[PDB]
């Protein structure tokens, strides 16, 4: 099943621009190791915009192939065509991916009742779970709340991440939706109080690098023990801000630089964290424990 | 050289969802017959979020074959991969294109510093003048004019597509700039405003439907008759206002199809304009002169 601390995976670039398989290998073993629940390659953290469409697939097999099944993989499938969210998604299914994490059209900005007749279609047309992802400070797009209320009645449409960080919104949903449709977190900042509403999950950018923590927080919240989770939140929250000291994941990428885990590499139009930013973002690694 | 109205020109598409190369063609002999200064295909008036590749080349071709030098062919060519940038602008060069528009990275919020290096690799790597295009409501990043400052220095980067609709911002480009590198409008209801300011042009959406007004009132206004080019703009508000009633292309689908110029088809996530949107617009056409 699909719930508590996923991750939503940076894919690593080596200095000259290609992928280092070596890397995203190290990556998953440790998200294996301390406590990861899924992962959601290929996402907006896992940089799809400059992603080919061969090294899309080429990455959301060889992750579920190192998986051995342990735990599930969500692919990151959501385009503004929607042709195009159809054929990925095709793809992601091939590579043998447990379900998909589909963006809500960006540039374009739909009508609401645009937004379902995407979705709806995209459906039916491959047999596979999907979770809608909301996020109007990326998509100059906003799903309302009667929109998803709407869907979440579709055949394998199975969830919403939702990342505008209003816990009243997340909480209006809950309410509109069924027992069994899940919501997650799209803000790392609030997972906690939107799990602690009812939520079943947070599709975490922070589980980059602390995803042991991260386990751990899921937990304490999705079991009502509200005094734990926000204990593990606050010694986090020197976190959650500084991986978004500059546009998701330029940070993160770094920090996992950091830590040794990726090389230094990202494609443009992303650029490399600012000098501006490196002490501020170092010195909270530390607070962390992430680094001394 | 490229300057006045300019039409952010639809395209045009059957029930069936195909394109209609019957109807793309009076598009161009009515712009051409009526003069406006320049075609823009391909934009987000055209559509570019939902066509193949292949599609868009096609569409590039048959009007810079239509057009046969007489006015500037102008081809939206932006992706938010710069390596996906390169490529849609070096297929427009090779389609006969005469410049290309190039919208900032949308849904993946680009550093000032990532948006800089960005255009310029691609205003090194295709040798074809190119305009950028900056419009914040649609992208959910934002180019500082302190940017655009940067860029104007660069050899073919010759303008910019100004549509935060904010005078001051207008006022303020301008200020920055040489006037060798051309500020246009690409916000219908102030471009008369911001041309008065010292802008020169307006890639307008209002010109699909009354191309001949455009031309007279950016005319007016680029003489230095503000008291005309305001009179004619005052008589366009409604107009303007009701192109937008739904969000953009399909409003003014449903006017030219009124006319009587293209199918009724518009290309998912789209949807065609909504039935509460047919009097308010179809009076504005009636109240403004273009329908009887």
Redo the contacts between chains.
């Keep these: 099943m699909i719930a508590g601390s996923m991750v939503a995976l940076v894919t690593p670039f080596d200095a000259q621009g290609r992928l280092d398989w070596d890397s995203l290998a190290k990556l998953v073993d440790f998200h294996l190791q301390d406590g990861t629940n899924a992962i959601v390659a290929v996402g ?1 953290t896992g940089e799809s ?3 080919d469409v061969e090294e899309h697939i080429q990455v959301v097999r060889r992750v579920v192939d190192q998986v051995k099944g342990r735990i599930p993989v969500i692919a990151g499938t959501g385009a ?4 195009e969210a159809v054929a990925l998604t095709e793809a992601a299914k091939s590579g043998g991916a447990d379900a998909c994490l589909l ?1 809500t ?7 609401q ?3 379902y ?2 979705f709806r ?1 995209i459906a039916e047309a491959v047999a596979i779970p999907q979770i809608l992802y909301n996020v ?5 797009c906003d799903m309302l709340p009667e929109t998803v209320e709407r869907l979440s009645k579709v055949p394998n449409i199975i969830g919403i991440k939702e990342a505008t960080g209003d816990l009243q919104r997340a909480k209006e949903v809950i309410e509109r939706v069924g027992k069994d449709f899940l919501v997650y977190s799209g803000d790392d900042a609030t997972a906690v109080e939107l799990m602690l509403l009812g939520g079943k999950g947070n599709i975490s950018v922070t589980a980059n690098v602390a995803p042991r923590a991260m386990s751990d927080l899921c937990a304490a919240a999705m079991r009502g023990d509200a005094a734990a989770a926000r204990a593990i939140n606050d010694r986090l929250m020197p976190l959650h801000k500084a991986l978004f000291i ?2 998701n994941p ?1 940070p993160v990428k770094w920090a996992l630089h950091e830590m040794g885990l990726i090389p230094e590499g990202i ?5 490399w964290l ?1 000098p501006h930013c490196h002490d501020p973002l170092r010195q909270a690694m530390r607070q962390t424990g992430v680094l001394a």
């Excluded at 059209?105 to 009508?111: F, G, L, Q, S, V």
Aim: net charge positive; proline share 11%; aromatic share 6%.
């Design positions: 907006t915009a400059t992603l503004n065509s929607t042709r963006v059209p960006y540039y374009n900005k739909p009508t009742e645009g937004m007749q995407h279609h109007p400070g990326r998509t100059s500059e546009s330029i494609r443009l139009p992303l650029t600012s």
